[PDB]
Amino acid sequence: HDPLSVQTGSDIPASVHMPTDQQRDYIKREVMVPMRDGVKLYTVIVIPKNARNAPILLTRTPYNAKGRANRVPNALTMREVLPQGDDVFVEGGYIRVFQDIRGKYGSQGDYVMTRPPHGPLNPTKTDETTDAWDTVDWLVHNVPESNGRVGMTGSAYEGFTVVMALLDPHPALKVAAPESPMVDGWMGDDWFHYGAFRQGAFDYFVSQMTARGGGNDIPRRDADDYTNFLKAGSAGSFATQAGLDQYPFWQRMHAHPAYDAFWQGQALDKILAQRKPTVPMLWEQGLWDQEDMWGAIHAWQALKDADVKAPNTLVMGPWRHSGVNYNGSTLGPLEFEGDTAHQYRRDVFRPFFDEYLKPGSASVHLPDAIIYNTGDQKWDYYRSWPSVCESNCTGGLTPLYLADGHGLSFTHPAADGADSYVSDPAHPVPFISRPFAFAQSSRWKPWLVQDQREAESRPDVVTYETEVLDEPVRVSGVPVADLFAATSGTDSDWVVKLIDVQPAMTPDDPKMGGYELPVSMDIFRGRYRKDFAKPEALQPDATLHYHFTLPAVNHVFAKGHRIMVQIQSSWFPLYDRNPQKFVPNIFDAKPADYTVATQSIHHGGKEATSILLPVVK
Amino acid sequence: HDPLSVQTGSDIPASVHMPTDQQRDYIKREVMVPMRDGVKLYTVIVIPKNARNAPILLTRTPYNAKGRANRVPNALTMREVLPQGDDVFVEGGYIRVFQDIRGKYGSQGDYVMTRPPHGPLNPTKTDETTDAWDTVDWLVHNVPESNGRVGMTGSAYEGFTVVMALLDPHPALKVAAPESPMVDGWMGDDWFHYGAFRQGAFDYFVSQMTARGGGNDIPRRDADDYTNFLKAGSAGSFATQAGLDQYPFWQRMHAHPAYDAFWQGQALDKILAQRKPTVPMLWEQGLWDQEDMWGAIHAWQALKDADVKAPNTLVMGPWRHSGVNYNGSTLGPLEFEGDTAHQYRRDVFRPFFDEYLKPGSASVHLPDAIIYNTGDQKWDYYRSWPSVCESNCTGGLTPLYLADGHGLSFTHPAADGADSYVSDPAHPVPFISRPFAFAQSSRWKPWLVQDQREAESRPDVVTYETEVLDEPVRVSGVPVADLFAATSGTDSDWVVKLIDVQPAMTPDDPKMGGYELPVSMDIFRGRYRKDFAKPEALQPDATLHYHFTLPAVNHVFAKGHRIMVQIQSSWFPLYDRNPQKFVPNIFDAKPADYTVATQSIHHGGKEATSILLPVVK
Amino acid sequence: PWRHSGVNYNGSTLGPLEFEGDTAHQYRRDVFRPFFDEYLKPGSASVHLPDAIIYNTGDQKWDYYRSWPSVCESNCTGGLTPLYLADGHGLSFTHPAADGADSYVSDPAHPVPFISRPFAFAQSSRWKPWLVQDQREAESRPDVVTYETEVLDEPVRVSGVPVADLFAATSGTDSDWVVKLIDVQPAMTPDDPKMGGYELPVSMDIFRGRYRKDFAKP
């Protein structure tokens, strides 16, 4: 029979060898790199055509290396095939490497969520540190087009693997750039913020741990997660209905609600500081990092306190989580001066890496910190940062006290007073307007810059503000909440927001008129007031002292603006509700545990609530 | 060691026992259904919880059955889990079945693009007809929750499987509804339109035939496919560079550019009419179906001509390809009276199926055709349709003649004349505004309703129009292009557009003022003027007679509007360029073959070019 | 299904709601015009209009009621059907035998925004469709009390004038009482995801308490 007319076989070719591969400006190599224990990791190596003695940029990920190196699947150019954040390195003729971490996608082995370093939580012979070590060693001995020099980078979990590598790096690892890294999931990164549980973790658990490869989110009943979580009750109740009780990582998390040995043995900022790395580091996070706000700044500061003898620079731009690898010209309704993300990548990131990865390159002398000013709209270069803080700094912090008539003053109010608000767990304050589902990435990403006017309009939120500013107030450093608060219950969460109120009218951009822009906010779970590792019941109606750091600022409250402070006791559904009655484990709270409570914030006198502001000249 | 602290194993559970399955209102059964030759087909059966004596709605697809039955992956309700087009059947308590056709995704066997029916092109013991027969037989003997009655539906390729089943159906198949079915890929469906090749097929080939499962599109050099295809030259040159020469189906298509035995043996409209089927049929296609305009109407008409002894109704709504399964409220800038798609599904589709699938249900008496009026904005029920055509109809067609001064008249112009335009293959007319890539689904879907003013402004397009209408002109049926055209070359394509010019000003919706809306347009490859199977060279400068049907219409050209006709010789990059020089195979046209030509359209006299309009009272 | 003066524009939508075609043009063309032609253009066809022509915001069609309404408090074919507030913040057609009460604190320093902040009366685009806005923001507040039926197994048809029969107490000596009748959309609306659980008010109003006994004498 004529094959050009009659097909009795298959129309699917046995093997494909398309000439589009010869039309590429790069070469893609797939290799199973063996670790010291025999476990092989899937590694993608993207080499520019005619590359000779080129440096290597490495990233280790739980997010499918094959896909990460395929922004535009099988693209004709390296620029399209690699992520937007790799732009400056593609332009620099770097060799790009993406590797699936142990137990994920193309890699063999067992997967352990944020696998702990060797120690009491990991008694085996391998960890993310040795895996990175073995990887770098293989690369410098099996990539002839390379110069044997490796640089490491990555954001979030991809930043976590960089930090792990820094614990004991291979001699060929010449430079590192952890971006929004997961450093302490309990203190202020992905899982908790000062012990307050982040409910978006459930979808992440099922999505990343259902299979070696891809997984799905938890099927929902309602389009609104405010509804879904409130109806389920406690976080543990939602997890149980989702089937998470059979997931080993959730089993461990549920067993360790407090900051005990399980979480302390995973605090990478403290562990890295003990090791005192000698590899040049560039730490980065967004000023509005909605997923890993604790990581970079705390790791960088710990290293500074440990007196590291290696380049250790902190970079913070006007970005959301991982925004550094995309376009940084805007965030929500905010507009910045140009693509700040590309600016950093091109003017700082790239030259810094070139110095150690490309022999003969110009030397860069980076300061302590490079931070974008969200007030002046420009990049600030700080030789020594911060210049103001609570201890061991040139100057101290400047308290902005809460006052009578819901005001704020830099003068300590002698008059004693208190403002009350009722916190009702049956009607928790939406962290962003309803309806909201964790699946709505477009709403989640810029949530930290949203207008706080909705919250202000509620009786379960207390708001304070200065008079309209006649002179600008410059802040640069870490604000500290010095809170004196009472609750009629035996437990409570305390949400503190530092806000920049835009001019009453903004005629050049009308929508921004009176807009309440939060520059720094966080939540503190009251039971941990005395000890993060040992939760304790609060005394009903007792004015108690809470003292905790808030996200860093580098802002200028300009003329016409106001400084504002908002305090509330819920932030739903991002954070699970504090039942306001002391229970052993808030994950297991029952319907009858949730108690309406009256909260009282004291102002003036010996218990003068204030925000310790890093005011500078 | 403590397992709740120390994990030396994997965080990925061996298997998941999700309790969310008990909250579902449906169950899913996955079965490998064996065909008569031993080959097993992956079949997904979606049964409403506690269903009994329920009818079955079956669809056979090359687009992943598992995914088709997972609109919202693992949803809690059957309504979410199934496609939007299944809404009325979910409400009716139907059992939904999606099956992977032989050789695709979860199914075994060899895959053959639009596998031809048993005959000269398929000498084996199986085909899509027997596969459907074996499937229905298994379903009625292995699904206890069913009443033994099966209904078949599906759009495009999923409609093609319905037609194939109708060739020799199982006695349990009580009713069928082919939607925009692939019936004749050469005459006017997916691959060609009157011999003019559709270049979007290349991406489809690589996406559907690279592997049993999912594939990818062809990597592009430029963002604009106008640029990509023009730079490549001929369609065969693009296919070669894409690596399609190793794909068996392309090898067969390339060897059969003309309507020979290979395509004639695949014309389902002619084959089905010869089989004398007795299964009630409901044929559907969009009035603006940009992918399968030929299929439904031609199959329905052939059966009507063969005096089919079964219900045979044609339905055409104001939809784009497969629009019947979504929301039919709008299309491009057009707005219709409500969700026309849901209206049809609820008022016609569902009750028709219920009559034969749910014993005891009310009987429906559908007319010849149910067509939406794109002028009156209402559903028309035509007992006998069409009422006007070339032969064997109640009335004849009404010619709208091209006239002097670029006008259009219902009066046969006595004066002989001609208008000329230069067709340059180096500057082909964009079918839609540049830039355009076949990957841009949002621009491709509603392309048939786009404003034709851009084309009008070009010197390589001739435009004719009536005076502003003082009285409405109603049309219902199939328009026929009666073209008398000459070319200075030895080959040429002829694009003819029937347009409704909106009122000069539309104050209630300003953007529509003077908008040139095409209600019916198509292309004809000149070499097939005398015979579709035997291409012939055209005589240079000879006025030749072209006679071909255009897409059906059911419209009213209202007062203030104009009727317009546009003629051109290219439609890029949707259709490959006619070199305008007769070559044996246009697929393999060489750079030197492409020739600039002068086109002349004659009007009036014995060669009075016109559009034979189906004008009705 | 229109906002104020919506009859003179396009009636295909209102906020996020979508109706069956341009309902405003439908009325203007099929009812308004022929009715006027009968008395203004001698020789025109006579039209026999019913008591009321009302669009059904549930069935998405025009209803022609010869006699409307068919149910009301006095002098109608039938009476009204009470939908009682119940324990557990529920709603029931069955009169609850036991006495109960739910409380909420009304603070004038933090009044409930009728629509999301910020809002200026100059923003006509936000003002026009305000009556169809989602009431989920209000529900989330402690100064708002919310009641709901279980998910409906059977449709409930309503046509006429609803009446608020309120038994309320305040610790003050005056108070406003806002009552909203809402249709909660299905938990999930896969064909239009944004509508899932949407709390659409079909009828709401406010009553100034001082006028409880007499509108003329507070």
Ligand SMILES: CC1(C)S[C@@H]2C(NC(=O)[C@H](N)c3ccccc3)C(=O)N2[C@H]1C(=O)O
């Ligand atoms: C590094 C990223 C590009 S991938 C990661 C991500 N996406 C997901 O987590 C998503 N569920 C996913 C995608 C692919 C495989 C597995 C899971 C996202 O966002 N993060 C980015 C970031 O931090 O910049």
Ligand SMILES: CC1(C)S[C@@H]2C(NC(=O)[C@H](N)c3ccccc3)C(=O)N2[C@H]1C(=O)O
């Ligand atoms: C029936 C459909 C829902 S799937 C089909 C489609 N999409 C593709 O062809 C696409 N390449 C694809 C998607 C998923 C798996 C494999 C291939 C599209 O559009 N058609 C729809 C229609 O006709 O209604």
